[PDB]
Each structure stands twice: as structure tokens, then as C-alpha cells.
Design a protein around this ligand. Sequence first.
Ligand SMILES: [K+]
Ligand SMILES: [K+]
Ligand SMILES: [K+]
Ligand SMILES: [K+]
Lengths: 46, 46, 49, 51
Amino acid sequence: EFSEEQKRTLDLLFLFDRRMTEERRRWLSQRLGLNEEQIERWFRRK
Amino acid sequence: FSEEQKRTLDLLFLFDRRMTEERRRWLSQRLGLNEEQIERWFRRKE
Amino acid sequence: EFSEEQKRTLDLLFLFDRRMTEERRRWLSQRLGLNEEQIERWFRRKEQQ
Amino acid sequence: TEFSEEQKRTLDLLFLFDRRMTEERRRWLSQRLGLNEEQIERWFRRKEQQI
Ligand SMILES: [K+]
Ligand SMILES: [K+]
Ligand SMILES: [K+]
Ligand SMILES: [K+]
């Protein structure tokens, strides 16, 4: 179903998306003055 | 938490949900698969 | 200076940052009620400042 | 003026967000392609003025 090059591209964007979501939590915590426990509890609710 | 923080949070939730949709289109165009076929892969990658 | 399985990775994210910047502009116009030509050059004219 | 305060308050936010994600993307690439943050940023500055 998925080629080796198509799965290679998806696996790159998945890891990249995972990293950006982590850093946003680090960035929002620093900026909004919150702990990473809360903001991730926020984004998981919605 | 502050009523100016749900601002920064509700925006980036709407911002990121819009980018996820558009990532799925761009991937459907660059790779050749449909969007369901892409959205299913990202989901099963958890 | 680079590689062939390192340039693709850089090429992919460049086309991806390219697409995400366009759509953001479209999404901001829809939301802030501005046009895409205002947005496009308010942004990255802030690297001017 | 041309831009609203309630609009500029969104535009400023996403500029800092994008600027921060661009930093971390470079690092994430500098720690995955073996190259460095002046190599990676050079490549992106090159393709930017068309390649
Ligand atoms: K839910
Ligand atoms: K396309
Ligand atoms: K399923
Ligand atoms: K890593």
C-alpha cells in the first residue's frame, strides 16, 4: 500500500511533527508561565 | 489560568489543526495517496 | 558539502515550510480579515526589524 | 493604522512561534544529518533565494 519512499517521507514528517509539538510545549511554558503538565493536558482534552 | 492564555492556546490549537489538514493534502499531492490513506497512517503511528 | 540522502531531507522540509507559510497566510486572511498581500509582507518585513 | 491591535497581537505571536520552530528545526536537523546549525541554516538561506 505504502511505498518505501512514501513511508520514508511520512516517517520524516511524523518525527518532525513530534519534535515541533514538544518544543511548542517548552515554548508555551516559558512564555505563558505554565508547567508542561498543564499545556499538554490542555491539548489532549481538545 | 489567565483569560489571555486561552487566547494563546485556542489560537495555536486552531492554527495547528489547520496545518495538519494542509499537511495531509500536500502529502496526498506529493506522494500520490489519498488523504484518508495518509490520515490513517499518521493515526496508527500514534 | 552535503550528501544525497541529506539534501532530499532538506529539500522536503523546504517545500513543506513553503506550503505551511502559504496556508498560514490564507488562514490569517480568513481570520484577521486582511488580504494575503498585506500579511505576506508584514511577515518577513519584521526581519527588517 | 492599517493593522489592528487585536490582529497584531496574533501576528506577533506567530512570528515568535515560527522563529522558535525554525531554530528547533535546525537543531533537530543538525542532530540528524550530522551537519551543523551554520551548515543547515546556510542551505536554507541558499534555497531561499531560489535554487
Ligand atoms: K478529544
Ligand atoms: K501539490
Ligand atoms: K484504525
Ligand atoms: K535526535
